Amino acid sequence: DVGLHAAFKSVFPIISYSGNAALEYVGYRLGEPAFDVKECVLRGVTFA
């Protein structure tokens, strides 16, 4: 269903313009929160 996953498989297959070279998409891996939300507020790191 919808999500970044849906967007990736939306743009997954790539064909080189007049070329034979492709970029297949395999499952993405989510990162771990670099900061805590309270720490982000203390610093301003957008809790990304």
From Swiss-Prot:
Belongs to the RNA polymerase beta chain family. Signal peptide: none annotated. The lineage of its organism: Bacteria, Pseudomonadati, Pseudomonadota, Gammaproteobacteria, Pseudomonadales. DNA-dependent RNA polymerase catalyzes the transcription of DNA into RNA using the four ribonucleoside triphosphates as substrates. This is DNA-directed RNA polymerase subunit beta. The gene is rpoB. It comes from Pseudomonas aeruginosa (strain ATCC 15692 / DSM 22644 / CIP 104116 / JCM 14847 / LMG 12228 / 1C / PRS 101 / PAO1). The RNAP catalytic core consists of 2 alpha, 1 beta, 1 beta' and 1 omega subunit. When a sigma factor is associated with the core the holoenzyme is formed, which can initiate transcription.
